[PDB]
Structure 1
Amino acid sequence: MAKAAAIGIDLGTTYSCVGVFQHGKVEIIANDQGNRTTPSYVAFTDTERLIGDAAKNQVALNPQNTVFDAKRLIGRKFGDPVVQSDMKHWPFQVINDGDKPKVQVSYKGETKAFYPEEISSMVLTKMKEIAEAYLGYPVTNAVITVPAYFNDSQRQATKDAGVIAGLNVLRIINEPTAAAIAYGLDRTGKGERNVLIFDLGGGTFDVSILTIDDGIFEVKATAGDTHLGGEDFDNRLVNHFVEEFKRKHKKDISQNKRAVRRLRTACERAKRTLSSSTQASLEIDSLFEGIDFYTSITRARFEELCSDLFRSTLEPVEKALRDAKLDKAQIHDLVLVGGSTRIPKVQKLLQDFFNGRDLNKSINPDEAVAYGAAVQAAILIKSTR
């Protein structure tokens, strides 16, 4: 029953996703708000602890006590220059407990501090409860994914987050490996198969090259930008609309925190529409000083606004190829991961770089990692019996 069942969890930097393999198919499980992905956010309020959508929804009202980006801290020392650099950009406090970072917040009127693995365990607990509500019984066996560049300390702290969350961690697997499993790229028989995984998420960009030799995976190269993602494209749209509001009304809105956040969420929404329509409309009632902001933008203008950022995704692709010592024509498969890979200009740039090649994109790119983890979790629990 529950003991013969296992879930696959993509514990992402900005969003998490949970899947289950049963009756010959993967089911990506929708949360209680009907969303197939859940924000990796934890909010501490005057009455409760919120996780996911409810935590992301109140981030503007409670920024000091709304934790996100715990994956950037997990398994790291406080003194790590990555930690010291990131801390300058977070609205929540990060403290030092014997060279280990802890996030410090106010919860039910009291000061509390949490290890990154404790924060990530609250996200994992939510993914576990989402699966349990769908299945109708508690599932505890799980495969959890991590970036291919995570070291032993980061992998161990992720497994620790799983244990705190009440999960039996069958295995910690690499995200690009889970994505290749989702597409069944390890079941092509004999001979070395070179796979490139292009992973453009909400806040990070990762390029991974893998060789699959008779089911055995080997990481040949990892490249990317830890601070490039979908949110940079939302911000380019924001700056455009701030300049357009200034041209129409001769008013600078950039200082009004509420006006900027409402414009930001509307921009994120319009950006998504631009992946399937050639124009998107913004409809913001009383954006600033009672002035409605009803406008539109073409996909052509959006592509111009992010042109330099889209083009920059090809330097880590080339860098990964040189590190792996492979030419473009030596790559057998191209896999898309992360919601931002739905952007047509991004697909066109990657396809043209690989000389007109087909892309593996039929699985929802923000779900492919949880899909493969769910497949692996089923194989692993079946072998355990």
Structure 2
Amino acid sequence: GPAIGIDLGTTYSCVGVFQHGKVEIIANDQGNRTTPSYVAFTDTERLIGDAAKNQVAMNPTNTIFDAKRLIGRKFEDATVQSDMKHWPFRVVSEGGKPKVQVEYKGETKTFFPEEISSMVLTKMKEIAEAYLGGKVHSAVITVPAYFNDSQRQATKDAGTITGLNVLRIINEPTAAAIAYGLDKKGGGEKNVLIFDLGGGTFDVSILTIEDGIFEVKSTAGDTHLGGEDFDNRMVSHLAEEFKRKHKKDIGPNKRAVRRLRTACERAKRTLSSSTQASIEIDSLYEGVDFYTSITRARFEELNADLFRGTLEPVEKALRDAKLDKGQIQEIVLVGGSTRIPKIQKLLQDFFNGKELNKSINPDEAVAYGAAVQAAILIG
């Protein structure tokens, strides 16, 4: 031991320990139970996690995120060429492999995706070591079910560089199903749908579980749909509102839009547990404050297509698995965006009122299942 589970997420990572028969998800040094998968290079230092995400607006070309979208791929891959068009950092080719290029200590440096991911893993390892005391030797690390062997190996390589013994690489939906004990529940074969809606990715997986054996039946989703898209919709609405009341267009002003997005991200979170949220921005533009409120109903309206549209990958995963929706025995919610009541309602209505597995914090379920698996493997 310790028995450690790591969800190495596209934008946020999570670490858990299995200790005294149960999982404890581990808060980092800022008290956050998830950590940005962000690495920033400055004139003096490397920042990882919250420190890196917190200065991203100040240092966008040297702050790396989404290394998960590059790991294990070739520079020439269509997803690489497409994704690069949307990143503020530079991506280059070395021996046909993508590398991020940054300025660090005043010089140009290049890093393989597994090097950036190892830095994130080192931060997750240190987070576990502050919580536990001593050293962490081994971990189970998760990857998307659709990852190929090159992506799995390059993720393991990030673990190796970090100096972790990688006990197993397991699929993220499998880890979520293990968190809910679905491999020990009830006994026959179970069809399980994992609905994982993150800040920037949406993955639907159908698995069968039988006598403790998992098989991936189908995968579907949208690799560029997440919680940030819902935030975009609220930002547009509220920038329009500020224009209506104060006759000022914040649109050409980067800092004003960024601060509006920060308020919107926070409001969206509150709206998963309250029916309204208050925006309180001091001097948003030309000394004019933006103090206002948004209701949950308005938020659902702004996102009607995006929320309802999550059922199309559900239908496609069923079609590919050759299953009727009535054949799903378990539905598991994963990702912070599944806290949104309207998403839960749409999903539950689609499945004819079936209850959802949602009692585990959905942004922690994957690390939680990875931690149980690690405990099993170290025995």
TM-score, normalized by the shorter chain, greater than 0.5: yes
Structure 2, gaps ≥5 residues long:
none
Match of 2:89 among 87, 92, 97: 92
> Which amino acid in structure 1 is aligned with residue 117 of structure 2?
S
Deviation at 1:25, TM superposition (A): 1.0
Residue 116 of structure 1 aligns to which amino acid in structure 2? Answer: P
Equivalent in 156, 169, 174 of residue 172 of structure 1: 169
2:92 aligned partner, one-letter code? I
In the alignment, what sits opposite 2:376?
379
* Paired residues for 1:198-213 under 5 Å: 198-213=195-210
> In structure 2, what is the equivalent of residue 349 of structure 1?
346
Cα deviation for residue 213 of structure 1 reads 1.0
Residue identity in the other structure for 1:6 = A
Which of 344, 362, 365 is the matching residue for 2:359?
362
Does the aligned pair in 2 maintain the 1:70–1:120 contact within 8 Å? yes
What residue number does 1:232 align with? 229
Give the match for residue 246 of structure 2: 249
* AA aligned opposite 1:42: V
Instruction: Write the deviation string for residues 235-289 of structure 1: whole angstroms up to 9, x where unpaired.
Output: 1010001110111112110111110111101100000000000000000000011
Matched, 1:79 2:85: no
How far, CA to CA, are the matches of 1:361 and 1:14 in structure 2?
21
The two structures have a TM-score, normalised by structure 2, of: 0.99
- The answer (yes or no) to whether the contact 1:189–1:214 under 8 Å persists in 2 is no
Q: Using the alignment, how far apart are the partners of 1:364 and 1:65 within structure 2?
A: 32
> Of 321, 324, 342, which residue of structure 2 is paired with 1:324?
321
Q: Which residue of 1 aligns with 2:220?
A: 223
Q: Residue 69 of structure 1 corresponds to which residue in structure 2?
A: 66
Q: Matched residue pairs, number?
A: 379
SS in 2 for 1:254: coil
For 1:120, give the aligned amino acid: S
What SS is found at the alignment partner of 1:133?
helix
Contact 2:3 2:19 in 1 (8 A): no
Identity fraction in percent: 87
TM-superposition CA deviations, 1:82-122 (whole Å, max 9, x none):
00000000000000111100000001111110000000000
Cα distance between partner residues in 2 of 1:277 and 1:245: 23
- 2:205 aligned partner, one-letter code: S
Q: Secondary structure at the match of 1:270?
A: helix
CA–CA distance in 1 between the matches of 2:11 and 2:373?
A: 23
**Any runs of at least 4 consecutive aligned residues in structure 1 with deviations exceeding 6 A, and if so which?**
none
Is 2:29 the counterpart of 1:50? Answer: no
User: Which residue identity lines up with residue 269 of structure 1 in the other structure?
Assistant: R
Q: C-alpha displacement at 1:189, in angstroms?
A: 5.1
Query: Counterparts of 1:212 and 1:343 in 2: how far apart (Å)?
Result: 28
Query: How far, CA to CA, are the matches of 2:366 and 2:185 in structure 1?
Result: 19
Alignment correspondent of 2:296: 299
- Alignment partners' CA distance in 2, 1:73 and 1:6: 28
Q: Which amino acid in the other structure matches residue 58 of structure 1?
A: Q
Distance 1:107 1:378 in 2: 39
1:5 to partner: Cα distance: 2.0
Describe the SS at the equivalent of 1:60.
Answer: coil
